[PDB]
Nucleic acid binder design. Structure first.
Lengths: 207, 82, 79, 86
RNA sequence: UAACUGAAGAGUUUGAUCAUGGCUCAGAUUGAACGCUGGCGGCAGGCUUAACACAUGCAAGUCGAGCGGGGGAAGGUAGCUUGCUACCGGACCUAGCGGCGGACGGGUGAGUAAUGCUUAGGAAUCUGCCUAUUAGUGGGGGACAACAUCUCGAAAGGGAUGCUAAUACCGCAUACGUCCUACGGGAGAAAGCAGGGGAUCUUCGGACCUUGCGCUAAUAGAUGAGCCUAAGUCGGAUUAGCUAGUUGGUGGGGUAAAGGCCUACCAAGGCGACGAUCUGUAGCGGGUCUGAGAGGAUGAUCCGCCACACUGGGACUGAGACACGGCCCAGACUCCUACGGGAGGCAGCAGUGGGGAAUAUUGGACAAUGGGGGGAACCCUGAUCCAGCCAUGCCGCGUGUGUGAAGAAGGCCUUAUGGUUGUAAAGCACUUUAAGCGAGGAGGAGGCUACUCUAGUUAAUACCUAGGGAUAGUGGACGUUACUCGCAGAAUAAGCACCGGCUAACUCUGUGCCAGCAGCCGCGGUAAUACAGAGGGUGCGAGCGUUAAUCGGAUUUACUGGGCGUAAAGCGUGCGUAGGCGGCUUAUUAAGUCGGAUGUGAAAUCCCCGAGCUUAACUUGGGAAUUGCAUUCGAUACUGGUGAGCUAG
């Protein structure tokens, strides 16, 4: 199962832009109701929260951008705790290693939902083979190319020109002419945005 | 008597055999005397297809153990390969 | 190459048979204190040399009677 | 019995039981005769009884009616008891 | 490279407070059940209760190359109403005798507190088929099934007379090994069948030669089983004495084998507070769940051992049984009957009735791995491999994507016009995973037959055995396989719990200690954020909740790790038995204690590094671990033993 429904109330509850829309218009012009919770009893951002509320609200925000549900997220945490290293760093590496996210960051999809649809509809090839699972883990030195029938899609060309506005990350090199790209290694924490706090998730799941 | 034969394991539609020396009256996947290799009829990629311990095989044959048809064919093929 | 036990004789009434008491010291599995345990073993003594109070050695052998499976080897100390 | 082979096995069983019982009674009788001669106590008579008894015991031991260990034990013990008569 | 890294609290006694102490909650887990809801795939699991009773079908056969009969097909030859007859050699089949198998594989946990199981050892045993080696396979005889006659019974099946073959049975002869022995000696076996053939003979149809499969005697190996020892293995003293074959010995019997295993005498021993006897409960282990660990609970699915087969008692055959689908006897129950006489045991697979909260099809194939028979061809196999049913569990996927606001309509609240539903919707532009339709299409099959060649055995090129080569055939239940490629169009696809605190998420209507809610504390007696509906929201998601059960939190049986003046808890006070503990110095011992080495600690399971499944579950290679046990070699500080000495007790 994948979440379907309204994305702007989703972002409004967390109070921050979750990048769930293409971005042709800024978030503030898009919703006009930011810093207001979706409910009628919705209030400003300054509402006091308990620690349990803060940890939960952070984990939900982390889940909502990547579109992962609770079972898979708990499995991700349990694997990251087993793997040696920083638990939050490992969890971020696992979340950023999914095939759909790599397709999105390579610029073949306007949004992560578009990337998921493209991957699921067998429009992507991994190392020369057409796959259809969004949660396939991408390893170092991989090659992701757009399938031949998938090429010449107006949505894909719009996605690549939109991605041109943002910056192509370091670990991904893309030939946009050939619709091809190469994942090299998992981003370190510095590459990812620093507003995300992972410690809250850590004690929330280690309670 | 004492035989050398295949015991089945693995998953449905993907058999994986251990090569065992055992009394013939025992159940196929039960009690055995000694395991001396394995056979994987559907190996792919880097997976090995047949490991057989030739010295143990010869030692047990010298004591009157009777290989099955499949195990004898596999032993001949392994000797041919190596 | 044969299992031997050393003990003290507690009975000699039976003909060609003696009863020797073996003692061992072990640790209690849970509380850790050292405990002493005792076992009474019937042995075969053909010539009735042993008597009550001597220290004897016995060795394991094939059954001789219903309750005897050990045989006397030597008398270490006399009473 | 439910099967034809089971019925045939039962038939062969009763036949073999009769045959083996007769052959075993023969050995018992000969050993009894030797024991009776021993009780009589004449050395020559006991020797004759033992010499007559031994071949029957060996013949029925070779057929599997009795075990060869049992036959050897019988022969040894009877020979000792005969020798005791001097 | 690695094989581990691990421990949270809260509510409730009182007008406050601190302590003590119970009760309750937050976690993990399940062979689960129930309520609402429900798209797909992969891999697993599926009578825990009545070891209750069972309709029906299947679950153990095979060998004519051991043997005599007996059948029904064709062919050939003869004749003649002429395509029909009668004769003759080969090809097939099998009721009976006989061999092997039926003691395996499959099911269940009733019984069993030790004849069982686990760990480590031992000596006095047997062992079909398999491997190695040695010596043989000579010559006779009497029977009995089938068959024929008679007879009983509707039958089912019984009974009585007369024949007959054999690798069926029994003498005689011979004996490298073998058994007994008084060391002189004595005793004991067997069976033939098949393929091919040069020469020779053939009393006329074989001898003979050779090669296989067989059979007899014996020694080793391997495998399997029997027997013995030590240490461990749940409660009860509101169970304290138990035992006369009982404990030991001698003569004899008995077993494959030690042994009161049995028997006749002789003696009075044997077990017990370190728990005998009696009594309740219970299959045991590898393991599984939980826990920081120590521990606690548990013994479905997988593997090893044990026990049982309607209830009890026996033995036969056999290498092996005291034998699930064998025999005899007793008992209960059920069935057929012409009343003469008979029959049966699903705790095998499927299935029925019943019980229960609750657990599935009266399916396919021997293609694969095994098992039985056979020289082979091949036959059997409810083991097994597959398929069907069930959200029971785990893992994965989908139910669409972007855009779209002077914020449409409608709903809910209100300080009555705003807020919210909400980019949500409509509208615009796109995509086709999975399901549906069409086409193609691996792997699970190694092999076997045909041809040819080489090497062995032989007198032989023949036969047989072991190998090589290319080609051609033949071999898949799953199966409309996995997988790949085309067509259609958003078209086929979201619910459940909750919003006073513990605990993330609030308002309005309806009712007024009523109806009702409730895990604990507690809500409702006209403004209910706690009852019912609605709007909104929160948490999960093909699932969501409730009930039941185990461990945890519980330091709430405290070994790790608690207490006893007043909270529960020092016997009314002494003496004393078993037991526990015990002053200083010295010599010795090596039991406790410590160290090394060797053997063992099954596999699977847990953990680590990899490999194959589009990923994951799952499968799998190698390690690490299995904290234990036994033997043996060392150390002597402390504890114990022994000898000597001392005076502070």
């Amino acid at each position: 199962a994948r979440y379907i429904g309204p994305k702007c109330k989703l972002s409004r509850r967390e109070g921050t832009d979750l990048q769930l829309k293409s971005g042709v218009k800024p978030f503030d012009v898009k919703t006009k109701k930011a810093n207001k919770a979706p409910g009628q009893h919705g209030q400003a951002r300054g509402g006091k929260q308990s620690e349990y509320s803060l940890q939960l609200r952070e984990k939900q925000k982390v889940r909502r951008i990547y579109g992962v549900l609770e079972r898979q997220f708990s499995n991700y945490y349990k694997e990251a705790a087993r793997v040696k290293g920083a638990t939050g760093e490992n969890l971020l590496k696992l979340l950023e290693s999914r095939l759909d996210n790599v397709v999105y960051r390579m610029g073949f999809g306007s949004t992560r939902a578009e990337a998921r649809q493209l991957v699921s509809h067998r429009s992507i090839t991994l190392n020369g083979r057409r796959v259809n699972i969004a949660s396939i883990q991408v390893k170092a030195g991989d090659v992701i190319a757009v399938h031949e029938g998938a090429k010449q899609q107006l949505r894909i060309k719009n996605a690549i020109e939109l991605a041109a506005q943002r910056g192509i990350p370091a670990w991904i090199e893309v030939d946009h002419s050939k619709l091809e790209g190469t994942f090299k290694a998992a981003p370190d924490r510095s590459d990812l945005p620093a507003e995300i706090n992972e410690s809250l998730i850590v004690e929330l799941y280690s309670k | 008597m004492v035989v050398i034969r295949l015991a089945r394991g693995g998953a449905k539609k993907r058999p994986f055999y251990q090569i065992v020396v055992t009394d013939s009256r025992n159940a196929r996947d039960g009690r055995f005397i000694e395991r001396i290799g394995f056979f994987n009829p559907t190996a792919q990629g880097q997976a090995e297809k047949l490991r057989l311990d030739a010295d143990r095989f010869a030692h047990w044959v010298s004591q009157g153990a009777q290989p099955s048809e499949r195990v004898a064919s596999l032993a001949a093929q392994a000797k041919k390969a190596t | 190459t044969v299992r031997t036990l050393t003990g003290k004789v507690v009975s000699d009434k039976m003909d060609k048979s003696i009863v020797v008491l073996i003692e061992r010291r072990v640790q209690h599995p849970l509380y850790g204190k050292s405990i002493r345990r005792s076992t009474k073993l019937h042995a075969h003594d053909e010539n009735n040399v042993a008597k009550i109070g001597d220290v004897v050695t016995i060795k394991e052998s094939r059954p001789i009677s219903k309750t005897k499976a050990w045989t006397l080897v030597e008398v270490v100390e006399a009473a | 019995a439910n099967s034809a082979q089971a019925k045939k096995r039962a038939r062969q069983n009763v036949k073999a039981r009769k045959h083996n019982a007769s052959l075993r009674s023969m050995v018992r009788t000969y050993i009894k005769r030797t024991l009776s001669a021993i009780a009589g106590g004449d050395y020559a008579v006991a020797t004759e009884a033992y010499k007559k008894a031994v071949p029957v015991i060996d013949r029925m031991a070779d057929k599997g009616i009795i075990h060869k260990n049992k036959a050897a034990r019988h022969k040894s013990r009877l020979n000792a008891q005969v020798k005791a008569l001097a």
